[PDB]
């Protein structure tokens, strides 16, 4: 060989390896992180991302009166003046009135432990289970997986059960319990960085995904107020708004208002999510975090730091200022904070972009108030759902843009009314900001999920399960309502999702029917619990070995196995194998007898019924084995013993066929 | 200048760039971290 081609092949190997290494650098520095699941519980009756979308799209204000079931002396802790200990001038704020509600029995927690358990831990457990279920992952099957749990939380002072009271109130447990109840093995870290806590955690989660330390991660936050201390003490300096509405970027901005909530995201690398065939909702492209540093007091924002973190997040995402279509601004509603944030957004985003595509600025806090540590992650959920619906929801309580900042540039505009999101020439992109009181800023950039058959199996079983019969009925009713608002979904896809992507619990039920006219009524009958023809119900046994019974004479009828010969290929193959093994000492073909073709002997003759029954029974047993039901034993009955022997491995197919055929002939 | 020696320069550039990229990967994943400063206050009169 000439030296030219000899060195050319080496050059080809070298440049291919160089391309591989460069791609590895690209995916190790900044890989896109897929948000494969989300869950949230927010004020205003929100308990899912769809609920949050319904709230924001309708422009509903979730601010409401204080809770009365928490032992608060709500009548005796309101006075108008802004300077008094133990008193506040705020009437209303966001709340989770079902914060104490918790399904203790589901997670194996006794009632006494649950009473001495922080509400944050309970809410985080429920939200994490919901997020895993919404991601297409069975939460039970995640046991032993290298899944991280990064959670933003704070010590809110919630306080035979002496042991439970210790681990039931430590903030470090707030993430750890999630990885203990579910059995996860990735790192569990509880972040605490004030309002930036959750979003910061998400950034850390992305790093944990990029280094390979995790295959999946939970990034989220939780905020609960067991006591009104956040309202009485913080109101001394007129920090809260009088009416309790977080007027974001409005001239009437005269303070903020607190709110409870919880929001988690099950996040995985985009390549890994694509490999496993997971549904990608959005894609965190890049993130950045820094600190205000030197500023006019510890609790005061700095526009330069916000510009820096926005630019750093854009650079990490590899996206321009003009590439982002909208931003979920922090928007605390404070008089001093809002102009600073507006100036930062104008300097960073609205500097070089077309005049006809201004940056749309919104704020979830206008709807639900300042959700606290859980705010930032909750923000992206909004910016995910809008990104799914292509509609930017309006920000409430904006009589006009605030005059402190100058909107003369026109590059940044508030979402006074809903604006349709264009879906042309590029993926939809957005940003979320979670600027914190302690000074730690955080900015996240989201991008629209990238754009991504088999024949329908007949009579696909629809499986349902639950811990208790009431939970099973609730599951059936919820599935019926969900399917009602759906334009003719594929039944096989629903069957696969129910069978694979859901945990099998104790109390089980099934719906098997070949037509899509009885499934709805059957689901209803299960919901109210009345019986139905195609409905099956039962209680699974935790332990027990399986047995295959092989009865002898009696179980014969004309045309048996005729339909399986056409529909089922495995049954046809097994019948063909039995036919080949049986042809030696038999003067007819089994397939003709089963199909009932002309001239074949009927089942009245003794010498043919036992071979046919043996072959059908063996084929059915092997079909059961093909579906994963491997017997732990076998039992026969007269001639069926022969068939049982063939399944026991005692006799080969040829030997069993010989025995049954010659014994029947004798 | 013939191709047999012309391609050698490209191969040398390619392998140098490959070594640089591999060094970048190793630095990005497992670079050691130097402890340049230390401080502690612990029981028993410890202050350094």
């Amino acid at each position, epitope marked *: 060989v000439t030296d*030219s*081609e000899k060195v*050319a092949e080496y*050059l*080809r190997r070298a*440049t291919l390896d*160089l391309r591989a290494a*460069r791609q590895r650098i690209r995916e190790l520095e900044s890989e896109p992180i897929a948000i494969i699941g989300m869950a949230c519980r927010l004020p205003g009756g929100v308990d899912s991302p769809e609920g949050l979308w319904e709230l924001v799209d309708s422009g509903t204000d979730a601010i409401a009166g204080f809770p009365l079931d928490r032992g608060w002396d709500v009548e005796g802790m309101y006075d108008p003046d802004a300077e008094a200990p133990g008193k506040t001038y705020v009437k209303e704020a966001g709340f989770l009135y079902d914060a104490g509600e918790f399904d203790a029995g589901f997670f194996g927690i006794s009632p006494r432990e649950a009473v001495s358990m922080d509400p944050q831990q309970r809410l985080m457990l429920e939200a994490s289970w919901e997020a895993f279920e919404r991601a297409g992952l069975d939460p039970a099957r995640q046991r032993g997986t290298a899944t991280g749990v990064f959670v933003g939380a704070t010590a809110t002072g919630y306080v035979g059960a002496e042991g439970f009271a210790i681990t039931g109130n430590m903030t470090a447990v707030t993430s750890g319990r999630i990885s203990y109840t579910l059995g996860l093995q990735g790192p569990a870290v509880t972040i605490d960085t004030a309002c930036s806590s959750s979003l910061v955690a998400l950034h850390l989660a992305c790093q944990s995904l990029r280094q390979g330390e995790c295959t999946t991660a939970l990034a989220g936050g939780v905020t609960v107020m067991p006591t009104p201390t956040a309202f009485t003490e913080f109101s001394r300096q007129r920090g809260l708004a009088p009416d309790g509405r977080c007027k974001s970027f409005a001239a009437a901005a005269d303070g903020t208002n607190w709110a409870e909530g919880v929001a988690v995201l099950v996040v995985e690398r985009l390549s890994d999510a694509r490999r496993n065939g997971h549904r990608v909702l959005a894609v965190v492209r890049g993130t950045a975090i820094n600190q205000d540093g030197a500023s006019n007091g510890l609790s005061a924002p700095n526009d330069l730091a916000q510009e820096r973190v926005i630019r750093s997040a854009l650079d990490n995402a590899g996206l*321009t*200022a*003009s590439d982002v279509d909208a931003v979920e601004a922090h928007g605390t509603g404070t008089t001093l904070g809002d102009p600073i944030e507006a100036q930062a957004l104008l300097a960073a985003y609205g500097h*070089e972009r077309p005049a006809h595509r201004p940056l749309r600025v919104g704020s979830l806090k206008s709807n639900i108030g300042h959700a606290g540590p859980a705010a930032g992650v909750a923000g992206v959920i909004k910016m995910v759902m809008a990104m799914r619906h292509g509609v930017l929801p309006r920000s409430l309580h904006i009589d006009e843009p605030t005059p402190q900042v100058d909107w003369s540039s026109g590059a940044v505009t508030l979402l006074t009314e809903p604006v349709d999101w264009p879906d042309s020439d590029r993926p939809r992109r957005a940003g979320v900001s979670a600027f914190g009181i302690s000074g730690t800023n955080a900015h996240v950039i989201l991008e629209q999920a990238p754009t991504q058959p088999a024949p329908p199996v007949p009579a696909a079983p629809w499986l349902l399960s639950a811990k208790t019969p009431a939970a099973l009925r609730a599951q059936a009713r919820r599935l019926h309502t969900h399917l009602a608002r759906h334009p003719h979904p594929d039944p096989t896809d629903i069957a696969h999702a129910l069978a694979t992507t859901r945990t099998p619990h104790e109390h089980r039920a099934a719906l098997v029917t070949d037509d899509h006219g009885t499934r709805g009524p059957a689901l209803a009958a299960l919901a109210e619990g009345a019986p139905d023809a195609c409905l099956i119900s039962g209680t699974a046994l935790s332990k027990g070995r399986t047995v295959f019974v092989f009865p002898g004479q009696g179980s014969q009828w004309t045309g048996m196995g005729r339909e399986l010969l056409h529909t089922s290929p495995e049954f046809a193959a097994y019948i063909a194998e039995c036919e080949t093994a049986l042809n030696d000492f038999v003067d007819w073909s089994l397939t003709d007898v089963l199909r009932g073709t002309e001239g074949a002997p009927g089942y009245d003759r003794v010498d043919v019924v036992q071979p046919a029954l043996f072959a059908v029974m063996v084929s059915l047993a092997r079909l059961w084995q093909h579906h994963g039901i491997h017997p732990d034993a076998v039992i026969g009955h007269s001639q069926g013993e022969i068939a049982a022997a063939h399944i026991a491995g005692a006799l080969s197919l040829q030997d069993a066929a010989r025995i049954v055929a010659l014994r029947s002939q004798a | *200048v013939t*191709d047999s*020696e*012309k*391609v050698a*320069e*490209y191969l*040398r*550039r*390619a392998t*140098l*760039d490959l070594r*640089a*990229a591999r060094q970048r990967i190793r630095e990005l994943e497992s670079e050691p971290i130097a402890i340049i400063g230390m401080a502690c206050r612990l029981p028993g009169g410890v202050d350094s």
Partner: antibody, heavy 118, light 114 residues
């Protein structure tokens, strides 16, 4: 770190001779073939010449406009390259760059200015 | 039968928009090796030239990730994602199929757009 530093530029009268030196550091100087490329003040880059490595015999090659007048040499003991220009003309005034590689100029020196005028 | 290359003589840019310089050769530069014997160099104002792209697509180490070469046969293109103030200069695309190369060509001036 790869470094190529040039020296020996400056003014010269027409018809005289000059010796532009190019010192290399941070890599095996023997392997690479060294090239000289000149830029007139206003025009595009012009390739002057180059010299192969010792393993290839150290044969040199020169542009048409500088054949005979110019001579490229090297020494691997000190790891230096030399461009000996003889009987310089007025149009030879230019910034001369020393580079490693006979066909791929992957690294360039800072460049040295040479002026020819009486 | 010497090979010559033609490119746009000038190309205004903006600080942030994409940019794309093009080159066309009168002969197919695809060697029998399956490589495009083309190289892109950049000369910044008052600085020595540096190598941006070699063999059409491969990016030299130390160059920013913004630059990317593409094309094959006769048509080639250097694409810049983010144009910055320091990216202004002269971009020379020059072949290596037929050596020696007498000149680098007129180049392609790049300057800010207004």
């Amino acid at each position: 770190e790869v470094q190529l530093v040039q020296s020996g530029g400056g003014l010269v009268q027409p018809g005289r001779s000059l010796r532009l030196s190019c010192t290399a550091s941070g890599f095996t100087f023997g392997d690479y073939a060294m090239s000289w490329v000149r830029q007139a003040p206003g025009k595009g880059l012009e390739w002057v010449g180059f010299i192969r490595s010792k393993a290839y015999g150290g044969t040199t090659e020169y542009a048409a406009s500088v054949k005979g007048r110019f001579t490229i040499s090297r020494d691997d003991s000190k790891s230096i390259a030399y461009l000996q220009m003889n009987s310089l003309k007025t149009e030879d005034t230019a910034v001369y760059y020393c580079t490693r590689g006979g066909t791929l100029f992957d690294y360039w020196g800072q460049g040295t200015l040479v002026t020819v005028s009486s | 039968d010497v090979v010559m290359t033609q490119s746009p003589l000038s190309l205004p840019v903006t600080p942030g928009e994409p940019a794309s310089i093009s080159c066309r050769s009168s002969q197919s530069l695809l060697h029998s090796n399956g490589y495009n014997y083309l190289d892109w160099y950049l000369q910044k104002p008052g600085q020595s030239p540096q190598l941006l792209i070699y063999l059409g697509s491969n990016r030299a180490s130390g160059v920013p990730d913004r630059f990317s070469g593409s094309g094959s046969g006769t048509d080639f293109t250097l694409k810049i994602s983010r144009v910055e103030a320091e990216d202004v200069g002269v971009y020379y695309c020059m072949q290596s199929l037929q050596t020696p190369r007498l000149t680098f060509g007129p180049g392609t001036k790049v300057d800010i757009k207004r």
